[PDB]
Symmetry: C3
Subunit: 418 residues, 3 copies
């Protein structure tokens, strides 16, 4: 307290800190529509066919000495296909081995394939022509039935809010498979067991809103919403559709079920690493600030303690009286007091410090004065996630792949039907 | 205030809190080089071949009675391959069915395959030998052309900062496919439409730096950098290369495009769950600390309010005067004041409290005194990510797979060419 | 200070803020058992077979004029299979081309395949019957050996804490492949080079514990544990097993190695986006609160500065004296003081302010009074992650796929063995 008076600077006033209105807003009870189908649908897959070798032996002289070979693949019709499913069995015609002479014609009798009921059956590539001056016939049948699964994809229109369940091939393209008409594709016959069925559900959900477009401080740049402890982006108010589900705030190749790459995982991993280090930086940046503030509160204490001998005791929550030596340093002595002071008189005529009989009140029943707000933080439990299969994993498509492969193998091992 | 004097402890001084210099540093304007190619490159894929059955019938007696079968796969040359691409068509020779007698030799006339232009064509495995004392020839042609895509992989050397675009097979290995020479592989002929072209881009980017090696408190253990609202690790100052892009702060199997596993997803999911719970713990740990501090500030208030009757009013931002009963408890009365006091005199001779005519100043124009720093938090918008296809999804490789399969099927259905 | 006395409200007391006991607890030195096997195991894969065409030519008259074709696939036995591995070679019988007449019987001599040692070998589908009144024999051999890899899966029982290493097929099912018995599957013979071996490791690890079930405030709803700078969920105290490793706090299709989808990646991406915006909201929500608190500390300052002229100087850490004009506004003058005051006397009789020779102490050696706690934040380094291959990538299964394909191709190109 010895100062140059000829240098008074001012007038001054303490700069209060900016209280910024939050750009991220929590909105409760946001109305949301969920539309969902079965992950996969039951598809009846059936195939049929025969390999035939009709031959005639007139010796080397005859131009009619030949072995005509055919491998017909047949379609299976709606009613048969259904029957096949019900029965977990498929129907073929009779196996004709070495039917020669006048029996050469058993071959042309049945081209639908009737009378044999098997679990399944594969061709045998049988052929012979060792009956001189005669025709020889061999005709082997193949057969297969499966009620397999194929992946659904739900889709809804923002125009009309109408939805449809698409059935996808191994590559993510929808395919025309219906309940009323058999589809013939990849050498096979396909029909739906069930008309594809969906369902809607209405909810009120908690959404985090973000308004960080400086030009449009009211435009909502991102919205994250809690659907059953799982987070979703619903910023765009178009229908949001993936796999078997569609969500909204009240035909080309689909792509979500494509196989993901290790490389994109690793980037998500780096993003996670980043988030962790981002958490640490900001937490510590906040830590440091508070500590600075804490220390200001210290400078406050030492100053006001020179007048208030019992303050340090209060702060430490233990009754002790302080005696200062400098502004900086001080001493402590133990104390304990009669705490039952509930009125403010005894035989009163301005008695105690800070100056303490209607001007004489008992304060047993008093109320808390709220001069502060507590902050409340919103960090809900998350992580109820679903994993979906890639589109190349459909049980139905591998079934189709299997019979295709089985045919390839049997049709290259020639058999003698004698 | 009744204390044991014989127990003075000290001298004491209030322990200030450690202000830790931040280990995570933000560095602005970090110079960065981006090198990028097309995700995929256009590859002309062409294939050709014939199946031939040259037979002679001299009866069972003749050892020369035989059916010689061959299936040649041919190479397609640079110029033809280009022509094929331009024309979306491929060229084959004439289809020879049942050419016997003196026409047996049509077979050997054309082995290049000229004169027929088709969109594409598959073999027919035709054969016969029913012309006694004569040779019989059948020769069927196959044909295919596609200008498909195959995935690029960029690579740069830290030595010399030279880059190259590699074209990968379905397994992630580079393959020698050039603009000047046709590559013959997997029974097919391949050439590039275009010389592989890249491009560079220089940027200044914001990077988060981390120095958490206790032994080397200056070594930078991790660096995360913002490239167009997407986060990258550039701690190592080697070239960072994935898929079609390379980044740097100014031949074996590649691996990023391998298919990722559900299991590694789930771990990333658990890491996310962890981060969320890590956020909650630390936020609340900070919450609690501040509340403790807030309550200290309360003990301060009650003490200094015994001298300052208008303080509580100021804090609550409403004019009220306080009267204390104990140290703890107090009463309130309403007030409102004339706020236009801009000088500090009236007819002044030490008038108001705290003691308030050159010693008499008007303070209309005053300045804010900055005794505090605001903290500033760095949490930029992220999430502009790219997804890449797995290496088994290249349109070009499935084309090659397709023709391979088509050949397999046709070469096991024998036809009679009579 | 002019107030309506007829409206005293009270008695009041300042509401302290709730200090909430943390629901997320850090527990150190949690005992954990790790069990681990090799990622993959060495599997000896061997295959063998022949294609035979035994024919007889008695002319068109003879019913015995026929070409009997067979393609046997053989099993390879334990000892041979081992020998094959050691030698990187496989054994076949002699190639018989056009052995006719009395040599027709070379065909039936050797059906095991002995005497030829090759790196590998493929069939040639050779056949002829151009020797009148004689049998003709052709028999070609195929051969293949690989010591390939197949993926391990570790599994442990909570009952008995016994573990086993399973060897998986391309679809994630375990297969019965042992050291003592050859397995015959997919037209091939398989045996283990090595008995499958695991190993255990005990650690003490730091775990984050969470108790957020309101009904059971002691139940531990989630536990995240650090295993070598990588985070794991060990809430459930069952064995946790994925791929080749099992962890615990002291046969159907396995699924972790299935291919993950782009769609599930994108959701993880949205979760990350969410976390970032969640970090920002909460950080800023905390920022705002502190600033409010900071400003309270300002109202405190101005009040107590009216009594303490040197306080503002202390806070700003520079010696200056304050003179007030209103309650709000003030002026500053420069100062600097003799700081060596280490006793509290000179020629003392109640000298300085706040009232400052055994009642006369030197304070060179004083101690810091801890009236505060620093908070300590726990954000450990993470991100030592492992990536695993999908189950369709096993070198051993593609080897099996390869020979299968090679056979398909050779068995549809007929050759004349004359
Ligand atoms: Hg005939
Ligand atoms: Hg006969
Ligand atoms: Hg006859
Ligand atoms: Hg990414
Ligand atoms: Hg009293
Ligand atoms: Hg000839
Ligand atoms: Hg003829
Ligand atoms: Hg002739
Ligand atoms: Hg991971
Ligand atoms: Hg006044
Ligand atoms: Hg015979
Ligand atoms: Hg002969
Ligand atoms: Hg002979
Ligand atoms: Hg997800
Ligand atoms: Hg002094």
């Amino acid at each position: 307290e010895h100062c140059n008076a000829q240098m008074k600077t001012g007038p001054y006033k303490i700069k209060n800190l900016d209280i910024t209105p939050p750009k991220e807003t929590l909105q409760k009870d946001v109305e949301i529509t969920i539309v969902e189908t079965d992950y996969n649908e039951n598809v009846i897959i059936g195939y049929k066919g025969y390999y035939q070798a009709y031959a005639y032996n007139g010796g080397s002289l005859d131009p009619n000495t030949r072995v005509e070979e055919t491998m017909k693949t047949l379609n299976v019709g709606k009613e048969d296909l259904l029957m096949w499913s019900i029965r977990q069995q498929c129907e073929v015609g009779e196996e004709l081995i070495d039917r020669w002479g006048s029996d050469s014609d058993d071959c042309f009798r049945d081209n639908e394939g009737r009378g044999q009921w098997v679990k399944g059956k594969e061709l045998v590539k049988r052929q012979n022509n060792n009956h001189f001056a005669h025709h020889t016939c061999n005709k082997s049948w193949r057969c297969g039935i499966s009620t397999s699964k194929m992946y659904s994809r739900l889709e809804c229109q923002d125009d009309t809010d109408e939805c449809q369940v698409y059935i996808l091939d191994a590559e993510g393209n929808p395919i025309n498979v219906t309940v009323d008409t058999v589809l013939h594709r990849d050498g096979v016959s396909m029909i739906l067991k069930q008309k594809s069925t969906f369902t809607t559900r209405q909810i009120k959900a908690a959404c985090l809103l973000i308004k960080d477009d400086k030009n449009n401080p009211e435009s909502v740049t991102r919205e994250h919403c809690l659907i059953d402890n799982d987070i979703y982006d619903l910023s765009k108010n178009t229908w949001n559709c993936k796999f078997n589900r569609c969500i909204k705030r009240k035909r080309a190749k689909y792509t979500e079920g494509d196989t993901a790459t290790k490389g994109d995982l690793m980037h998500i991993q780096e993003e996670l690493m980043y988030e962790n280090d981002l958490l640490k930086m900001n937490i510590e940046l906040m830590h440091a600030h508070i500590n600075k503030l804490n220390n200001m509160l210290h400078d406050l204490i030492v100053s006001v303690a020179k007048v208030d001998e019992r303050l340090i005791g209060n702060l430490m929550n233990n009754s002790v009286s302080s005696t200062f030596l400098s502004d900086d340093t001080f001493l402590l002595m133990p104390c304990t007091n009669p705490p039952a002071h509930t009125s403010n008189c005894y035989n009163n005529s301005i008695y105690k410090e800070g100056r303490w009989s209607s001007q004489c009140i008992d304060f047993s029943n008093y109320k808390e004065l709220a001069i502060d707000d507590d902050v409340e933080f919103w960090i809900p439990t998350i992580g109820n996630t679903t994993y979906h299969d890639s589109w190349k994993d459909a049980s139905g498509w591998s079934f189709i792949a299997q019979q295709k492969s089985n045919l390839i193998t049997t049709m290259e091992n020639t058999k003698f039907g004698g």
